[PDB]
Amino acid sequence: TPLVDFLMQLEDYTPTIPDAVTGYYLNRAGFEASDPRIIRLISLAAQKFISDIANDALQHCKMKKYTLTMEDLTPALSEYGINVKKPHY
Amino acid sequence: NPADNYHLARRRTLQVVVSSLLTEAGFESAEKASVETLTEMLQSYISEIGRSAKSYCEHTARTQPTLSDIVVTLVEMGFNVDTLPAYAKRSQRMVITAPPVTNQPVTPKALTAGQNRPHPPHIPSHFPEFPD
Amino acid sequence: LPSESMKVVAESMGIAQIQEETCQLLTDEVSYRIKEIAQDALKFMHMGKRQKLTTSDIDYALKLKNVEPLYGFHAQEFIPFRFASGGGRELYFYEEKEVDLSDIINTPLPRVPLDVCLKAHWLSIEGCQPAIPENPPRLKPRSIHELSVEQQLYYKEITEACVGSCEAKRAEALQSIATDPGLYQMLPRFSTFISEGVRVNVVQNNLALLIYLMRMVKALMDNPTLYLEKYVHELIPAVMTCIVSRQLCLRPDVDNHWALRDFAARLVAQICKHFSTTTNNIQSRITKTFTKSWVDEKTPWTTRYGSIAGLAELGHDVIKTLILPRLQQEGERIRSVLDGPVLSNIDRIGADHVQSLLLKHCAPVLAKLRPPPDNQDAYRAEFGSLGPLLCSQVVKARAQAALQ
Amino acid sequence: HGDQECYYQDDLRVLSSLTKKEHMKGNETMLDFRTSKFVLRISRDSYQLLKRHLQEKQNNQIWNIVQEHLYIDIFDGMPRSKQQIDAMVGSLAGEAKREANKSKVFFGLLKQDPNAPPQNRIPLPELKDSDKLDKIMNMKETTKRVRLGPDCLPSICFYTFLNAYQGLTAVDVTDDSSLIAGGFADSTVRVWSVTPKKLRSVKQASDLSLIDKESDDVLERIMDEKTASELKILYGHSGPVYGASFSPDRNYLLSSSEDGTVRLWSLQTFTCLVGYKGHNYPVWDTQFSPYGYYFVSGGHDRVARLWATDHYQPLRIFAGHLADVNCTRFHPNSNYVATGSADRTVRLWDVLNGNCVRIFTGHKGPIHSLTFSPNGRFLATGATDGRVLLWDIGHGLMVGELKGHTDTVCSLRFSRDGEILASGSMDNTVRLWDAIKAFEDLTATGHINLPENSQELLLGTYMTKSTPVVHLHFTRRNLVLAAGAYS
Amino acid sequence: PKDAQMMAQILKDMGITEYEPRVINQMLEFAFRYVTTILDDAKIYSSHAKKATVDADDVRLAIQCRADQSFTSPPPRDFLLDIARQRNQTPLPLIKPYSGPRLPPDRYCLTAPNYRLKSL
């Protein structure tokens, strides 16, 4: 079981999102901070989701780098099935 | 104003997190509407594992969620959980600091000590004392 | 909503050549859904007892109508973002629409406020509302004083504590003056006690009696409840009863403590100029006194010092205009004290204090309007008073600015 | 729409939006208004002039709309004045029939009382020795209880929530002033101890298994001192907690929220026990029975359910309102449930048979507070029009009207003796009303010609510093408690 | 703005005097989201009928097929009164009454041993 062996190595490894901020949005939904390593996995799973979108919007910016735009987020989230909206206001 | 600082201490911490995640193998100087977009998807993502892993544990008659309730919550959001031990061990991994506390002094009041009057018998002793 | 905004949205999407009846059909459908939600978001506002209609009310009003409070992005598969909201988008009309990605990281995060606590107080004591800070606030008959006997006892205890026999007693009495809400309707007797005290307390220059009264004035001023500018007329002379004024006591030593008292008096005077201000009555009147105190031949040296301090603490522009054409006179006075012939009066001490204060003000003014070039001998065009030491003070100010 | 009464202004703006058919086919309040009959209580002296203008064939179509969509309930008496008709109208399906308000209601207290179940007198389901120990120390508080009246005005102790940046939506106090609950918009319930006695949880099951037989070991040896705070936060609602209700044995906190569940929190373990999912919609209120077994919860789905803390499903569904059941209050004998609502009606419901036995109309806004008299003979209701209407229960005529408040009256309570009704509103005022001079006088006509006694019945107003009075409580020594969340 | 000043009049016609400034911004965000999913479905229905111009019957179809799924309502009065009289006349059988902490069956409560992982 790799994912049990992974979570047992998270007493160290402060992630990119703090646990005072990841734990705030978990307490907002009823998830209470029993284990602080449990928060760091949810903070890692939410990093990897945002990082996978910013890494795929970079491929849609190299064909047309150095600036992330809404016309790069639009085809990047379209394979995810997410139609992003331009503010237009 | 400490009223909107209840929300803006944690949403402007998520703005530093997205600004630290868009710099790791990536951008500098992003568009402003693209940062408040991505930190709105970040707050909505933490709030969705909050509501759904609480729902999966309480369906199984429990009150606090284990690991087996989140690895079914992240599956129902399409996450591919196995790639997460490799993401946690980056060399580009960064830590964003938590927000500051409004009550830095904690106990800065000398106070005003005035006692006069007692209590009538329909007021117990644990209610506050009658003023001067 | 206007139809000429709906055609802009349609032609910016790929749907060109839309009729007016087609376009009017869009703006009565969406204007109903805004009216349907704002009437439904007012239910959460009335059940919140906040009469505010916060940004989260529309997030629950949308979720109630089975529409995702998803803003700015819509997921057709619905699974990563269900009816949980993301708190909207912090966007403005007057925004920049482009930021640097390290500007958002380097700014300090706002302070998380205090958690919710439960404090109890009293709205009514057997029918009467108390004046605590948690609450909004033929022979003619023998008359009664307008104070109660608690109020005269209180007044007597506060005044006998404010003459500073014990320091903890003073400090509480000063905090009691600083935050008693019912200290109005006793304020004539406090103002009269201050004013009368300084005038019979400068007959013999009793420094503590004066330092305690000035602290009482400062404690009277920062109280937010009481109305002070009915009593400021009597107070201005009483607080300033010994600023420039000489000392009938040992002037040379405690000249440190009385100078500190003068600094406190300057600060209260600056607070008074900031407030109680109407056209050409208070600030200009004390400015005119201070200037004719300065432009006086054979000036009292304990006074060449109090008036100098008073003029100095008046703000940014006042020393920028009033402390410019007078450096030569200050230097000549210093030279005379230095010549001697004998130390008949504490003239030398007064001169040293005046020169140090004037030199610090001149540095800060110079640092403020000009670059720090030629800080070695250009100040010799201004009689060479502070020179390189003034330049070092300017450099320390620049270092403080860099730290900021 | 311009020649309508001024108290119908919030009713017409819902109709100005309704212009299509499919807009009205999903409203479900105007859908039930179109199928019901307006009751329209009129006198026989005025009905003769109406029927002499409608039975003729010159009009012949407005008479067809009247006899299709309107009931007419005729009473033999004087035609009412305009300021008396204004006092008892304002509800859709308004001014209900007198045949609804003629059922026999057992409005008396349990243990003679002829208008109350003579011998059953359920003294709390299985009244225990610990519950009998509570009433022993309750009558020690009654010894120090002051007679309030119009002379000895009570002292009000406001328990303000200072920071409260999550919006406080629900307060409850126990019957002895020992706990204060707070329902908040951040989906939390927070219990505060107000006596100098910290909130303790009971020990874990390993620590209770070693506890030896006898040697006392009953109600103090089980309380854990490792867990002892002045504040316990309860998590588990996924939405703002709108109802809060203590049980009379000081266990069993109840809370209802936007997510459609009613939750039963223990106060011995400080965890959640049950989640009662019967509504799919925001449950706006809940309350335990005064004997502590049943509880009623009213929600957005226009019903009020009766639960029993033993079944996952309700026992009685009170389903006659046409809008949201805002309030749900039990009678002091717990045989009757009063449910105020957003269609400007208050309805009493018998717990047997689930039948509506009284319909109280005359409010102009949604009812946001109900309370019962300690006699059980009267009922005070408050709504957004700032009116406190005092209703009889054996008669059903709302004898009094208190019109001092300006904004929504969100909290009412009578005294422990019944001497004073306390009213708290969004005007940041706690008004005290003489609840003895209001009922001093107390049919064949359905009204009593109530006077303008509001000025005489006022004893005090007590403006609060920017703080809406969410709860009002009376200590057993007749001391007013109030809780507000300072804004 | 143009469309944001009409949004402050839809709220004022509904009597909403006090509202947050972010309330107008996200009702416009919902109104934009609603019209770009009617018109997106309208040209899908136009391509089904094979016409190059999206006319008014396409928007009549796309409104009533989006309002059949999105905007639901509470159950109706003839449905609530039928399940009431089926429940208020049903004798709700029986369970286990006296049980100290009186409660539903244990598969309907939230009282389980409630495990957690061993820290190692």
UniProtKB/Swiss-Prot annotation, chain A:
It is found in: Nucleus. Transmembrane segments: none annotated. It comes from the Eukaryota. Allysine formation by LOXL2 results in release of TAF10 from promoters, leading to inhibition of TFIID-dependent transcription. The [KR]-[STA]-K motif is specifically recognized by the SETD7 methyltransferase. The TFIID basal transcription factor complex plays a major role in the initiation of RNA polymerase II (Pol II)-dependent transcription. TFIID recognizes and binds promoters with or without a TATA box via its subunit TBP, a TATA-box-binding protein, and promotes assembly of the pre-initiation complex (PIC). The TFIID complex consists of TBP and TBP-associated factors (TAFs), including TAF1, TAF2, TAF3, TAF4, TAF5, TAF6, TAF7, TAF8, TAF9, TAF10, TAF11, TAF12 and TAF13. Belongs to the TAF10 family. Component of the TFIID basal transcription factor complex, composed of TATA-box-binding protein TBP, and a number of TBP-associated factors (TAFs), including TAF1, TAF2, TAF3, TAF4, TAF5, TAF6, TAF7, TAF8, TAF9, TAF10, TAF11, TAF12 and TAF13. Component of the TATA-binding protein-free TAF complex (TFTC), the PCAF histone acetylase complex and the STAGA transcription coactivator-HAT complex. The PCAF complex consists at least of TADA2L/ADA2, TADA3L/ADA3, SUPT3H, TAF5L TAF6L, TAF9, TAF10, TAF12 and TRRAP. It comes from Homo sapiens.
From Swiss-Prot, chain B:
Induction: Induced with triglyceride accumulation. The modification Phosphothreonine is found at T107. It is found in: Nucleus; Cytoplasm. Residues 12-79 form the Histone-fold domain. 'Taube nuss' means 'empty nut' in German. It is linked to Neurodevelopmental disorder with severe motor impairment, absent language, cerebral hypomyelination, and brain atrophy: An autosomal recessive disorder with onset soon after birth or in early infancy. Affected individuals do not show developmental progress, are unable to sit or walk, do not acquire speech, have poor visual fixation, and show poor overall growth associated with feeding problems. Additional variable features include seizures, spasticity, and joint contractures. Brain imaging shows hypomyelination, thin corpus callosum, and cerebral and cerebellar atrophy. Component of the TFIID basal transcription factor complex, composed of TATA-box-binding protein TBP, and a number of TBP-associated factors (TAFs), including TAF1, TAF2, TAF3, TAF4, TAF5, TAF6, TAF7, TAF8, TAF9, TAF10, TAF11, TAF12 and TAF13. Interacts with TBP, TAF1, TAF6, TAF10, TAF11 and TAF13. Component also of a small TAF complex (SMAT) containing TAF8, TAF10 and SUPT7L. Forms a heterodimer with TAF10. Interaction with TAF10 is mediated mainly via its histone fold domain while interaction with SUPT7L is via its C-terminal region. Belongs to the TAF8 family.
Curated annotation (Swiss-Prot), chain C:
It is linked to Alazami-Yuan syndrome: An autosomal recessive syndrome reminiscent of Cornelia de Lange syndrome and characterized by delayed psychomotor development with intellectual disability, hypotonia, microcephaly, short stature, poor speech, and dysmorphic features. Changing I58T: In ALYUS; decreased interaction with TAF1, TAF9 and TBP shown by functional expression studies in a Drosophila cell line. It comes from Homo sapiens. The modification Phosphothreonine is found at T107, T179. The modification Phosphoserine is found at S195. The keyword Ubl conjugation applies. GO terms for molecular function: aryl hydrocarbon receptor binding; DNA binding; protein heterodimerization activity; RNA polymerase II general transcription initiation factor activity; transcription coactivator activity. GO terms for biological process: apoptotic process; DNA-templated transcription initiation; mRNA transcription by RNA polymerase II; negative regulation of cell cycle; negative regulation of cell population proliferation; positive regulation of apoptotic process; positive regulation of DNA-templated transcription; positive regulation of intrinsic apoptotic signaling pathway. The modification Phosphotyrosine is found at Y184. One of its GO terms (cellular component) is cytosol. This is Transcription initiation factor TFIID subunit 6. Keywords: Apoptosis, Disease variant, Intellectual disability, Isopeptide bond, Methylation, Nucleus, Phosphoprotein, Transcription, Transcription regulation, Ubl conjugation.
From Swiss-Prot, chain E:
It is found in: Nucleus. Residues 108-120 bind DNA. It comes from the Eukaryota. Induction: 6 to 8-fold by apoptotic signals. Component of the TFIID basal transcription factor complex, composed of TATA-box-binding protein TBP, and a number of TBP-associated factors (TAFs), including TAF1, TAF2, TAF3, TAF4, TAF5, TAF6, TAF7, TAF8, TAF9, TAF10, TAF11, TAF12 and TAF13. Component of the TATA-binding protein-free TAF complex (TFTC), the PCAF histone acetylase complex and the STAGA transcription coactivator-HAT complex. The PCAF complex consists at least of TADA2L/ADA2, SUPT3H/SPT3, TADA3L/ADA3, TAF5L/PAF65-beta, TAF6L/PAF65-alpha, TAF10/TAFII30, TAF12/TAFII20, TAF9/TAFII31 and TRRAP. The TFIID basal transcription factor complex plays a major role in the initiation of RNA polymerase II (Pol II)-dependent transcription. TFIID recognizes and binds promoters with or without a TATA box via its subunit TBP, a TATA-box-binding protein, and promotes assembly of the pre-initiation complex (PIC). The TFIID complex consists of TBP and TBP-associated factors (TAFs), including TAF1, TAF2, TAF3, TAF4, TAF5, TAF6, TAF7, TAF8, TAF9, TAF10, TAF11, TAF12 and TAF13. Belongs to the TAF9 family. This is Transcription initiation factor TFIID subunit 9. It comes from Homo sapiens.
